Amino acid sequence: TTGRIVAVIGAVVDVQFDEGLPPILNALEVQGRETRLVLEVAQHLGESTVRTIAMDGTEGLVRGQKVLDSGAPIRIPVGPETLGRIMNVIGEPIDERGPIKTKQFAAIHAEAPEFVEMSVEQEILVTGIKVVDLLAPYAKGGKIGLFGGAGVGKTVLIMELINNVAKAHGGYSVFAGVGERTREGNDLYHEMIESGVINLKDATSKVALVYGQMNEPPGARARVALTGLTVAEYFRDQEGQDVLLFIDNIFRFTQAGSEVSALLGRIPSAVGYQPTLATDMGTMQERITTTKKGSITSVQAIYVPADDLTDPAPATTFAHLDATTVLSRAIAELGIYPAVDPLDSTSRIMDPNIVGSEHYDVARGVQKILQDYKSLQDIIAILGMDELSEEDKLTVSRARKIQRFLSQPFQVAEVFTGHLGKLVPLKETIKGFQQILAGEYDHLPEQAFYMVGPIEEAVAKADKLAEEH
Amino acid sequence: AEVSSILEERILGADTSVDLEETGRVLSIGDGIARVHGLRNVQAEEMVEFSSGLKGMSLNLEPDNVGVVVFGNDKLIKEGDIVKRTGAIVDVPVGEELLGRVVDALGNAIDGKGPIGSKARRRVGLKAPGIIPRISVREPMQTGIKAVDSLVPIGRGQRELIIGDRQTGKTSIAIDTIINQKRFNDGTDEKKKLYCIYVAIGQKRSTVAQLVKRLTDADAMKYTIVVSATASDAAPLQYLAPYSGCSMGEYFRDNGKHALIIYDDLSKQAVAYRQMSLLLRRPPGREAYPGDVFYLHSRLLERAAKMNDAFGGGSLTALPVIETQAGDVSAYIPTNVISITDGQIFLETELFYKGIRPAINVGLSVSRVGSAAQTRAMKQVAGTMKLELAQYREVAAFALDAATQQLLSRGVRLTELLKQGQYSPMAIEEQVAVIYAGVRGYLDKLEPSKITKFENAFLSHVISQHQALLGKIRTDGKISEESDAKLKEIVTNFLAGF
Amino acid sequence: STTSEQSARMTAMDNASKNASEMIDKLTLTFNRTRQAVITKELIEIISGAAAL
Amino acid sequence: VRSSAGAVRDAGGAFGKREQAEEERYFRARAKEQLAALKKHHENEIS
Ligand SMILES: Nc1ncnc2c1ncn2[C@@H]1O[C@H](COP(=O)(O)OP(=O)(O)OP(=O)(O)O)[C@@H](O)[C@H]1O
């Protein structure tokens, strides 16, 4: 079918069809553009008009420009040929390496898996990060969140996870950059090329990249998440294999949805969000799941506007994740990195029957001691450390040692700290914290525990500190 | 006599060609927005012209009329007027012909001084460079402020943010950065020359005149463009000035050269955009800003790239200036631009009045590049200074034992070292010398109230007797062992003799 | 000295608690004003958006 | 409206910084003492 632009307002284009209308969510191609501009139908306004959001700049559009109706939603190339490439929302490559030559095209809109497909098995995924492994352990096939404002470590943490899990992971992997800095996209492309997950010579690439950065109009940011999700879904089903799916950030999907709602005629809700915030986020987060046919481990970075965890967007996102690791600025100011908040992070598998009673008891002891420390900090502000019960000082000392011992140096944060990255096996973290609580180290100074891997490294650092005393 | 003759020379060449042009009738004009009827083939965000020679941009394409925003005053447009489409998306002149010229948001010379000889034009609304052209930020952008070059370094291609309250010293940092580039621009190698662009948005014309005369005094208009969309300029011009300046800088980076652009402020471009959007009747959003208020800035700051050597190698740094209300960084536009940019530079009034100027809050100020984009000498010294200040800030709220007493002493010495004056940026090697003297425990003997004296005096000594050492540090770009031994003896001698 | 010191600490803590109570009253009044203002502001934003379609 | 534990240092006002410093100075002193004892133990256990 052929239609005709009748209005252009910002990123929203109204297209009139003289024949039969196209169904909602269909992709339309504007005729007369040097590049490829794809509109996506979002509403039927009657009188044969359809409102649409443009997946690209609507500059140079003319009231009357003819439009073609593709007849299907946006169909992206999928398969093992997308690995090592980069893509738009509409699937065309932006790595300047030639066409993606697949046999399968998958539409980016699909129904979520039905209830009779859910896997109910959980088993810890050891990431090598002390705080994550101890207090909010992840799980294979589960959805992970990384909340936190700006400048707290979301990108560094997710890069560290790609460095660890993805490098030594047999299955494939997908990375969707949604409305993030293009500098970071280029940096990740080059870091993968150096590491070897993206191989530009052979066909041994293990990572497929999709990018829709923050220079894109809202239409493209609101859908690049669906494009990456489609690639991951295909690798989950047809390939029948494990997949990882990293998204950064998944707040830009919501925000991009909010930048066009007012122009689509919807009354705003809550703090100027679209009325369909929860439904729009659910119809996406419900396709990122571990069905019985495959298994997607989804790590999501979630911007929290102004550190406000009660904002509608992060607040709604909380209910869609198994594990969460709420990075905190108040802890990043102290220099504890990663700034994961030990009391605001949770996991579903964190039960004594899934991890074990030793792990569970160590984690709960750490959390309790930190909460008691918080209770004491109010008193120390009036008395002073000198006036505390000789037992309370012990709680404060243990709490500070535990606070420092959760910090860890990443292999990707060499540039900042200058130190060297450490991977700490789970047993070593449990032993370290159990010993720190049991009192087997109440003579070493606090700073010995700052930015070290296993506990023995803290002992060695203390020895060095004493020798050069 | 010849005055009239050169006046005639202007008539001698005119614009005889009258063409058959598409048009439209102004159904309704009011508040700076016209609703033209006609212009069937007018594009989106095209430039149209009015019967009085006044320009405008077709922003809304509704089925029944075209919503046009007037780039200028609105009293001269009547109803039933005539709007002629120029058939060209909004674009501005670009080139080295603009250097040293004050121009308005549309590239018209504003200081007399004749016209612009620009031989090329560039569209304001151009897409940012892809993911492949760019390359990680390597070189350092020398700002001249000690606390910025040492603790929150800025590379070329980075997008720093200067955010603070009113009258904390943001334009001062911008002007110091602009003035410092004189030493590099005067030299010979073209790989260090950095052409500066200053976009002045919503600032009263007196402020921009003060700024331009200040740059002229420091002989810094040889390489500066000033794009002024002052307060009395219709909102459609304050909206568009950042994009015009960004095009003027995109021309430089696209041709292997380096550019610096300073939007000042972006919090006023946001207000102008809100006024435009509310007068086009588009529904408001949060705090009445349109929904597309993040896009507005993200598409603008994403053009500050660092092209790889295949695409010329040119760069374009950006230093947007935001203005918070009583330090409420958590506001709307501040948070948007904070999550758009790379680093930040938090200026605080509590530090401005406590004597710390520039007020740069080194505790919160960040720079993602950090390590990279810093000279090796500065990298060596500022690291230890950063650790010392980080330790000092923990134990500062009070004021015993020798170790912590000396820690506080060192912290205070460094703090009074980081202070600075106005429009006197320092060469990187001089900063290295001063910071080295301060951090190698030499100043710990002196009183803190006297540190500034030393600082000043020290430079005026090293700048004359030991020019060779500073040249060595600059050329070799590191504190070699022999350079360190020299520095050591110079500081030891000078301290006692003072 | 210890008797007088303990008496003085009791008196000082009483005065400090009284001052904290006055400050709490003032801040509670301010908090109520600010909460109502925030409710009204958000509601007016919603109303303006609804009527501006 | 309620109050919760660890709020004095969440505000970050003057009491927050005062408490942070009161803690840091004390534990710097104790770290110094413990490091001295660690050095002494090192030397006394070398043999
Ligand atoms: N390093 C400094 N040393 C001494 N004074 C300074 C310094 N930096 C700024 N000031 C003072 O601060 C005042 C305001 O400076 P500036 O215009 O840079 O701040 P601003 O925030 O841009 O102001 P506004 O936002 O109102 O334009 C100036 O009058 C200047 O005297």
Ligand SMILES: Nc1ncnc2c1ncn2[C@@H]1O[C@H](COP(=O)(O)OP(=O)(O)O)[C@@H](O)[C@H]1O
């Ligand atoms: N593991 C870490 N060690 C030290 N510094 C870190 C670490 N992670 C993040 N940072 C600091 O945070 C900055 C990067 O934050 P980033 O995670 O990119 O922002 P966001 O999380 O908001 O996307 C760096 O400049 C660095 O100083």
Ligand SMILES: [Mg+2]
């Ligand atoms: Mg990030």
Ligand SMILES: [Mg+2]
């Ligand atoms: Mg100013």
